[PDB]
mmCIF file of C-alpha atoms in Angstrom:
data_model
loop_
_atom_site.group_PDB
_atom_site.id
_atom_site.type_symbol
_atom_site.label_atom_id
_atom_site.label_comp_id
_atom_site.label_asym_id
_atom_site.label_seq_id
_atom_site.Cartn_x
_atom_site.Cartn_y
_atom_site.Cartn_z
ATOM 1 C CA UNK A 1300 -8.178 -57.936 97.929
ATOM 2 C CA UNK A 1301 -10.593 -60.352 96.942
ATOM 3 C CA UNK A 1302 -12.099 -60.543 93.284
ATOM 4 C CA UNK A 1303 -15.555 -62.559 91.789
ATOM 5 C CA UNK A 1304 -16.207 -63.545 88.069
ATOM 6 C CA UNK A 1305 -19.219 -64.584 86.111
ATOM 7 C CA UNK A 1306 -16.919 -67.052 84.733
ATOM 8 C CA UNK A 1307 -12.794 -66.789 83.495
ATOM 9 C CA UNK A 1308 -12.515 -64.271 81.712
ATOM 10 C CA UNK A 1309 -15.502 -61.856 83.139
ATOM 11 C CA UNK A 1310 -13.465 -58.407 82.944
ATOM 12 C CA UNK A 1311 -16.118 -56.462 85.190
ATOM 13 C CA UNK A 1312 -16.281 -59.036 88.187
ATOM 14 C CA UNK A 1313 -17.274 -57.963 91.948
ATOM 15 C CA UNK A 1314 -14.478 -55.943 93.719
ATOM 16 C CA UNK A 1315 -13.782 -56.451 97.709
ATOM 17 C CA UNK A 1316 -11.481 -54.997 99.986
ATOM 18 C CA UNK A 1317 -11.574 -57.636 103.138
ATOM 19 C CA UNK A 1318 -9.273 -55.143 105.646
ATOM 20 C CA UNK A 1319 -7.585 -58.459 106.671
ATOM 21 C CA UNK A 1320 -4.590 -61.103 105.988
ATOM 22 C CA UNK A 1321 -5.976 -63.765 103.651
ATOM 23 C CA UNK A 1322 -5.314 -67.123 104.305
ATOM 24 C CA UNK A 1323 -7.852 -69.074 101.988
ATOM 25 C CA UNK A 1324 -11.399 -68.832 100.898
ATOM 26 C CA UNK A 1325 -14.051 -71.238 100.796
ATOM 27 C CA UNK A 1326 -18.154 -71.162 98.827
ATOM 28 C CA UNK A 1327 -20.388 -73.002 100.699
ATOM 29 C CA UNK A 1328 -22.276 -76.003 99.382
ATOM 30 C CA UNK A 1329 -25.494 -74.087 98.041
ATOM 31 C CA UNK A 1330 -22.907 -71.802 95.884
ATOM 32 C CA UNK A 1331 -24.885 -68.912 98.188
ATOM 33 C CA UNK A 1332 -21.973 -67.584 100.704
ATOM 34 C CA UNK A 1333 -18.233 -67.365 100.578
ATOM 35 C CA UNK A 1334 -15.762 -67.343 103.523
ATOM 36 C CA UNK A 1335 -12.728 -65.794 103.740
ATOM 37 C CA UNK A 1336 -10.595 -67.287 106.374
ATOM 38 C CA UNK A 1337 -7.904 -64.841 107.648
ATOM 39 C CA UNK A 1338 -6.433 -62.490 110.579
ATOM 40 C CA UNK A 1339 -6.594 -58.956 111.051
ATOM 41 C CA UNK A 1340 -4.352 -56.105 112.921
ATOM 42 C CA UNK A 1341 -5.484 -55.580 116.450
ATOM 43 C CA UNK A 1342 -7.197 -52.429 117.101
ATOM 44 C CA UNK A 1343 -5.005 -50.893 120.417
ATOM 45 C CA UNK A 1344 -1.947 -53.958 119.737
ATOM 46 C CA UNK A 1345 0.846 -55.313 117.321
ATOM 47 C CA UNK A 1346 -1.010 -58.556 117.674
ATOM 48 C CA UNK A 1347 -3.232 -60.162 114.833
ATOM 49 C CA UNK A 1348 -6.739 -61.822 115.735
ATOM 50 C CA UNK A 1349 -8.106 -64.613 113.588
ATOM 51 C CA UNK A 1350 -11.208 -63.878 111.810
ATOM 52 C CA UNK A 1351 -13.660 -65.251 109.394
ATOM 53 C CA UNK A 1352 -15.444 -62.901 107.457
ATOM 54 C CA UNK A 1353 -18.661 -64.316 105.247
ATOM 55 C CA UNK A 1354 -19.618 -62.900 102.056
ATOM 56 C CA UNK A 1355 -22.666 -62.754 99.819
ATOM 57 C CA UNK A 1356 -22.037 -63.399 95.796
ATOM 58 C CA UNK A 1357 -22.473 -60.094 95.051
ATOM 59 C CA UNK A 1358 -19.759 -59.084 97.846
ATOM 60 C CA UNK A 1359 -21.490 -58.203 100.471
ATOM 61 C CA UNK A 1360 -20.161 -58.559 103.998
ATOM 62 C CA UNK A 1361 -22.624 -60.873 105.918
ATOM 63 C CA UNK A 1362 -20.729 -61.386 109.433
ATOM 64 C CA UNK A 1363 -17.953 -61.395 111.374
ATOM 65 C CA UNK A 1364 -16.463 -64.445 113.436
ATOM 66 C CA UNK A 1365 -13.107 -64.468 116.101
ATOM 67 C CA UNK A 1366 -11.434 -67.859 116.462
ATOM 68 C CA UNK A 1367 -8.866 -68.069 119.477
ATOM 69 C CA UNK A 1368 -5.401 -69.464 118.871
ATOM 70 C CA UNK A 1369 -1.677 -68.308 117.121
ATOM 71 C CA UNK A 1370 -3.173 -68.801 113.357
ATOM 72 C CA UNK A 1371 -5.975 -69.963 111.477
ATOM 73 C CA UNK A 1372 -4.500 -72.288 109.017
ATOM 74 C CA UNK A 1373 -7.365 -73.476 106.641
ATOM 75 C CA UNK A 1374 -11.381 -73.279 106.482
ATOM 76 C CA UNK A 1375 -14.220 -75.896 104.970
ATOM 77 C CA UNK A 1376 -17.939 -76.293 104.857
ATOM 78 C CA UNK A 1377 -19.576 -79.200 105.922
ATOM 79 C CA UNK A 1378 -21.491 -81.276 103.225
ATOM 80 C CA UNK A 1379 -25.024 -79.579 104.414
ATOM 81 C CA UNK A 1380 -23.629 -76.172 104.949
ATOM 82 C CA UNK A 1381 -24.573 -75.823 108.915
ATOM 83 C CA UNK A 1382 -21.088 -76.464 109.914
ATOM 84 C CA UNK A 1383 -17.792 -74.490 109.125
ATOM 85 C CA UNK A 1384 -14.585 -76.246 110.152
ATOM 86 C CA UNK A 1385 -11.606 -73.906 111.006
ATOM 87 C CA UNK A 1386 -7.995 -75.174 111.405
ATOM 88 C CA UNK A 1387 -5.876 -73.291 114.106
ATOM 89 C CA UNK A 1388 -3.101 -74.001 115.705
ATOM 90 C CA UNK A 1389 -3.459 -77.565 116.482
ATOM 91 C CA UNK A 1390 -7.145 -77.069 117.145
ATOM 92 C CA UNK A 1391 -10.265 -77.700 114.631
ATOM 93 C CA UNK A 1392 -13.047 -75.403 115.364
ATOM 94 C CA UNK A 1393 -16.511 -76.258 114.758
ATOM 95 C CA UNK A 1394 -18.850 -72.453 113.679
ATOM 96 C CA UNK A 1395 -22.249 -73.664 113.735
ATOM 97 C CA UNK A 1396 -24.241 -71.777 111.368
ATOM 98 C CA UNK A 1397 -28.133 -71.029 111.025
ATOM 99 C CA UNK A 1398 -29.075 -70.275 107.546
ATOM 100 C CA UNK A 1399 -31.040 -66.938 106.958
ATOM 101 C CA UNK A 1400 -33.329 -69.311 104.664
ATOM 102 C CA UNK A 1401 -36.287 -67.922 101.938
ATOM 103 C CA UNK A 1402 -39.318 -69.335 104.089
ATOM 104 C CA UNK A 1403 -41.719 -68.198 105.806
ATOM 105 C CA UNK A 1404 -45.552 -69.837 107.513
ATOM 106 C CA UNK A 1405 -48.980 -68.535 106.678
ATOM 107 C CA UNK A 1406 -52.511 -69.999 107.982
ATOM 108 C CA UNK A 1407 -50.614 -74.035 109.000
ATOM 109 C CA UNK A 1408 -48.686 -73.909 105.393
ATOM 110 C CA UNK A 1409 -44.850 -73.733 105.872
ATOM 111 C CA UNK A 1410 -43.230 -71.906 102.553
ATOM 112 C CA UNK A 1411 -39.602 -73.444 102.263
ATOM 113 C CA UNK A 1412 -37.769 -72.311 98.785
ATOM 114 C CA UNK A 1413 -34.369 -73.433 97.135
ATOM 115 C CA UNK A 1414 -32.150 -73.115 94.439
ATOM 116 C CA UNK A 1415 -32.393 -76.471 92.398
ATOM 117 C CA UNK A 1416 -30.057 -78.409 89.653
ATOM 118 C CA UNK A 1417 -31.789 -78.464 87.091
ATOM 119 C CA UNK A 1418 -33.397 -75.115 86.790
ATOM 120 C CA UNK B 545 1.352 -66.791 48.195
ATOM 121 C CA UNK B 546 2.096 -65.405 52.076
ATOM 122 C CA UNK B 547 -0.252 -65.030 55.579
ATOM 123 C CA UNK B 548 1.514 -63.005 58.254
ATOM 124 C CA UNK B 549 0.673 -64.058 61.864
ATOM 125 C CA UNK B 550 1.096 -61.804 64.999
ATOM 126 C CA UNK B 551 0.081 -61.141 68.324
ATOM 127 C CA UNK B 552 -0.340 -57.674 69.711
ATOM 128 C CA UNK B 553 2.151 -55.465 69.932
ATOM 129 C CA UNK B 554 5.085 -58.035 69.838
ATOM 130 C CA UNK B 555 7.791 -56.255 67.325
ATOM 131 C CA UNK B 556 7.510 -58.901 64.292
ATOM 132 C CA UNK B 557 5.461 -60.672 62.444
ATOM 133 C CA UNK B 558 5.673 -64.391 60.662
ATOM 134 C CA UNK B 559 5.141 -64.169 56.895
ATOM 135 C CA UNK B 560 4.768 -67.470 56.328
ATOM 136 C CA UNK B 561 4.637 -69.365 52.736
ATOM 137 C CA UNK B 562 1.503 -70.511 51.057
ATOM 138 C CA UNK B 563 1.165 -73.323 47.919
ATOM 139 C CA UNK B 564 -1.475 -70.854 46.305
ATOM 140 C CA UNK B 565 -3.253 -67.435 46.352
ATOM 141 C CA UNK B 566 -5.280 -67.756 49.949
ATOM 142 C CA UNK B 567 -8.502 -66.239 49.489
ATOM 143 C CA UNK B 568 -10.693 -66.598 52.938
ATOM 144 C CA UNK B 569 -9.137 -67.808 55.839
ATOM 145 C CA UNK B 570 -10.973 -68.489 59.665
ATOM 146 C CA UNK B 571 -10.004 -69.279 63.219
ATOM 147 C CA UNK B 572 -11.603 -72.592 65.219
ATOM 148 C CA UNK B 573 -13.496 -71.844 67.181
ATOM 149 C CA UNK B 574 -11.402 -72.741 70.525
ATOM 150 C CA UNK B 575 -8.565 -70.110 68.388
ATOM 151 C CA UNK B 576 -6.263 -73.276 68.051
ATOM 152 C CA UNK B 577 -6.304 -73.577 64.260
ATOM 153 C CA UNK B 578 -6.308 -71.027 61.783
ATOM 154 C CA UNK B 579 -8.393 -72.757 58.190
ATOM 155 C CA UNK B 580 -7.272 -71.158 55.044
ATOM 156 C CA UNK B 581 -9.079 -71.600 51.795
ATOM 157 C CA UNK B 582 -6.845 -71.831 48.432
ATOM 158 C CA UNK B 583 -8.045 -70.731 45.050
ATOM 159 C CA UNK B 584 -6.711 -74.224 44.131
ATOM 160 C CA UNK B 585 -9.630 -75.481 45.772
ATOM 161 C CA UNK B 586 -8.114 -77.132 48.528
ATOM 162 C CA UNK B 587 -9.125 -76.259 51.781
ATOM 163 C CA UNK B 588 -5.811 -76.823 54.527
ATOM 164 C CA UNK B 589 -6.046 -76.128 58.384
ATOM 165 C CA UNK B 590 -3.225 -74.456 59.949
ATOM 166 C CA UNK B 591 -2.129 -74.299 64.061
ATOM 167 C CA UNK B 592 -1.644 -70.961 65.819
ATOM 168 C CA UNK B 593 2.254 -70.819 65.666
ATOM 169 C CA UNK B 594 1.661 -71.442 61.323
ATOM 170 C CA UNK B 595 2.746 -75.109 60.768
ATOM 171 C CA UNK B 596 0.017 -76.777 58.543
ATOM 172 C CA UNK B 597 -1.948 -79.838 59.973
ATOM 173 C CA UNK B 598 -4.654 -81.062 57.629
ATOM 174 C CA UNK B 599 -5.461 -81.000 53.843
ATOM 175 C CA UNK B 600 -8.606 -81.562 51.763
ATOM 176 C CA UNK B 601 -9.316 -81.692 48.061
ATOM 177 C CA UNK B 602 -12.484 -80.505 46.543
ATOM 178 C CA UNK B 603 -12.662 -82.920 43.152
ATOM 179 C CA UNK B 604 -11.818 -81.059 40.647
ATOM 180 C CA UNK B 605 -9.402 -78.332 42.206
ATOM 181 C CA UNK B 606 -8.823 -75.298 40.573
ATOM 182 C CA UNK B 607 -12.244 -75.244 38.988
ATOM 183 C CA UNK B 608 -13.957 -74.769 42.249
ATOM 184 C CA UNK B 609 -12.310 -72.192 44.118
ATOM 185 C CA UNK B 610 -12.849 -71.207 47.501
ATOM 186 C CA UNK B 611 -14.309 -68.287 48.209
ATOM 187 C CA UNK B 612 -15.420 -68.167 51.642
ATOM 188 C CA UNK B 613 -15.490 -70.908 54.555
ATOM 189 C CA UNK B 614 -16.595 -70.071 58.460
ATOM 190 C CA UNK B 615 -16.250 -72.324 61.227
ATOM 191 C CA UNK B 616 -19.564 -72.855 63.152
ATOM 192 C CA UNK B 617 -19.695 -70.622 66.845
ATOM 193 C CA UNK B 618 -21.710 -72.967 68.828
ATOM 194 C CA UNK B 619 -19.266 -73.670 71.661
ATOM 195 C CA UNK B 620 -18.839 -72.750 75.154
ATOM 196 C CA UNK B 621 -15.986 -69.761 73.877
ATOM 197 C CA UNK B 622 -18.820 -67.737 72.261
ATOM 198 C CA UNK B 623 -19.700 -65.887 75.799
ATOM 199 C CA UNK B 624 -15.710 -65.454 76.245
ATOM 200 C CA UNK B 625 -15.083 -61.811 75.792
ATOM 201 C CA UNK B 626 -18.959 -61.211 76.416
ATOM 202 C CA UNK B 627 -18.249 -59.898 79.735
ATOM 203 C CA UNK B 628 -16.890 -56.578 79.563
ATOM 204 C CA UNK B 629 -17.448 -52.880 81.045
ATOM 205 C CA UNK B 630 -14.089 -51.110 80.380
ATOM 206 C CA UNK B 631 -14.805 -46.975 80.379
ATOM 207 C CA UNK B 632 -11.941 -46.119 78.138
ATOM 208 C CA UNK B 633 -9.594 -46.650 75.648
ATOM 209 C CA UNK B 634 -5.584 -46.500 74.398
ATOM 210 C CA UNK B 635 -4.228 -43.446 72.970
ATOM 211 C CA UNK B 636 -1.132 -42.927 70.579
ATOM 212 C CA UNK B 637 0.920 -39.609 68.845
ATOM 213 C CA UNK B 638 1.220 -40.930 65.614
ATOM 214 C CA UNK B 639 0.956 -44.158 63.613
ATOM 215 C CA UNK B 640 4.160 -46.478 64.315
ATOM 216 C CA UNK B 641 5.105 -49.220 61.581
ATOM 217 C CA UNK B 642 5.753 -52.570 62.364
ATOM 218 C CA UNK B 643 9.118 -54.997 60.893
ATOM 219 C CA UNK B 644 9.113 -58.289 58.983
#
């Protein structure tokens, strides 16, 4: 079960079922996704897969992504969000990750847009 | 002469003692302190479990009583408990009393 407030004591927050053993969660840098770090049941074996599963905000499920290895111990972003580190079993992983950015080109102008600090 | 604190549905209540007749009373705004106003004209500021912390005179005392005070709600707490959605609500046989 995972759970999402407006702030600490928001008593209607976002509600998510992840189908999965949770091992930690993690928002990226940009506030914009959350991933769930975890394993899940295998579907013809008693034998658990590792899986990250990504998350918008308002809970819903972006992706999907297998790791190889006995457990996935711990996830974190890198500082500029196109990296996700994954600790398992004696390994770190290294997702790279390709932002579904707000941008688009018209007529040799490039439209780039982003969430900013002070507005 | 006596201001009766409790939190709900606990089985008692703390009736606890008062110099004067305590005409408005009002939480901080974080809920830690409880301010009561006296007809004595003495405001005092009480904590949540009823032990009293501060004092202060108006010159003059019982010639200016106190008839209502408010503590200001601009802090971050005023959009705690502005988040809800609940569909329903708590229902009961009959009214219950509660002791002390």
């Amino acid at each position: 079960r995972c759970q999402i407030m407006r702030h600490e004591n928001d008593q209607n927050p976002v509600l998510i079922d992840t189908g999965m053993y949770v091992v930690g969660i993690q928002w990226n840098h940009m506030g914009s996704v959350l991933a769930v770090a975890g394993f899940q049941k295998a579907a013809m074996q008693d034998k658990d897969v590792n899986i990250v599963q990504f998350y918008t905000p308002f809970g819903e499920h972006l992706g999907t992504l297998k790791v190889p290895g006995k457990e996935i111990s711990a996830l974190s972003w890198e500082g500029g969000g196109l990296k996700i580190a994954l600790a398992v079993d004696s390994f770190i992983y290294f997702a790279n990750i390709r932002p579904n950015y707000k941008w688009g080109y018209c007529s040799n102008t490039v439209v780039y847009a982003y969430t900013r600090p002070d507005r | 002469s006596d201001f009766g604190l409790w939190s709900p549905e606990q089985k008692s209540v703390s009736k606890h003692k008062s110099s004067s007749k305590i005409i408005c009373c009002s939480w901080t705004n974080d809920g830690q302190y409880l301010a009561l106003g006296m007809f004595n004209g003495i405001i005092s500021i009480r904590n949540k479990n009823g032990e009293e912390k501060v004092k202060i005179e108006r010159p003059g005392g019982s010639l200016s009583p106190i008839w209502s005070i408010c503590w200001n709600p601009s802090s971050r707490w005023e959009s705690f408990w502005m988040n809800r959605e609940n569909e329903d609500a708590e229902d009961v046989i009959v009214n219950r009393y509660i002791q002390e």
